[PDB]
Amino acid sequence: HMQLSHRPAETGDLETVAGFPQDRDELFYAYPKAIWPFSVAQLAAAIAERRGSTVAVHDGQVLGFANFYQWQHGDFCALGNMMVAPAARGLGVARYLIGVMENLAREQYKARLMKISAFNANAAGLLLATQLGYQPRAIAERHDPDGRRVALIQMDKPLE
Numbered sequence: 001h002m003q004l005s006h007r008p009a010e011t012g013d014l015e016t017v018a019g020f021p022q023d024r025d026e027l028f029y030a031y032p033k034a035i036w037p038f039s040v041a042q043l044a045a046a047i048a049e050r051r052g053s054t055v056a057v058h059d060g061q062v063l064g065f066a067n068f069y070q071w072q073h074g075d076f077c078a079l080g081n082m083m084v085a086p087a088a089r090g091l092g093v094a095r096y097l098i099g100v101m102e103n104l105a106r107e108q109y110k111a112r113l114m115k116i117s118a119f120n121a122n123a124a125g126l127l128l129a130t131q132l133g134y135q136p137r138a139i140a141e142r143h144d145p146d147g148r149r150v151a152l153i154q155m156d157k158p159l160e
């Protein structure tokens with residue numbers, strides 16, 4: 001069914017990926033420093049600052065995007081910017097990309113651990129990470145775009 005492949009993100013993918021977040025909450029979950037409306041320029045700025053920007057493809061469509069927020073050779077990487085096409089939610093795209101990013105963290109960065117953090121309102125992300133073997137380690141206070149306090153739940157998982 002949902003055959004998925006991956007490759008590094010390319011300039012040609014920017015518009016498509018920038019179309020993924022459907023509301024301010026979704027943008028905040030994936031890219032908390034971004035400002036709504038999202039734009040190719042904001043996506044390109046993240047890609048420049050980060051590593052490992054990767055897309056997931058199915059039936060000739062880019063359906064997902066992720067990168068590393070943090071990377072420390074021999075130590076850990078932290079997942080960032082997970083976005084999924086609105087017509088492909090709940091089909092395994094985020095799960096698939098997390099596995100790809102785990103492999104890349106192991107292979108390229110010799111990471112022993114992957115970190116995933118999710119904002120408290122992002123139930124789906126918390127639950128998916130839990131399904132994939134991530135455990136919560138800490139909770140940090142953050143603020144949303146309206147200045148309201150939110151909880152960032154910081155999870156991790158050993159790699160192999």
Ligand SMILES: O=C(N[C@H](CO)[C@H](O)c1ccc([N+](=O)[O-])cc1)C(Cl)Cl
Nearest residue numbers: 020021026030082083084094124125
């Ligand atoms: O789909 C969600 N969260 C997933 C969990 O894997 C992920 O955090 C995500 C965030 C933003 C997004 N987007 O804006 O396209 C897509 C997936 C919630 Cl918005 Cl319901």
Ligand SMILES: O=C(N[C@H](CO)[C@H](O)c1ccc([N+](=O)[O-])cc1)C(Cl)Cl
Nearest residue numbers: 040041042043044045046047048049
């Ligand atoms: O700054 C630029 N490129 C960098 C890489 O050198 C990166 O691609 C980027 C693009 C857009 C951007 N932005 O508009 O915020 C920031 C960085 C060009 Cl606009 Cl000159």
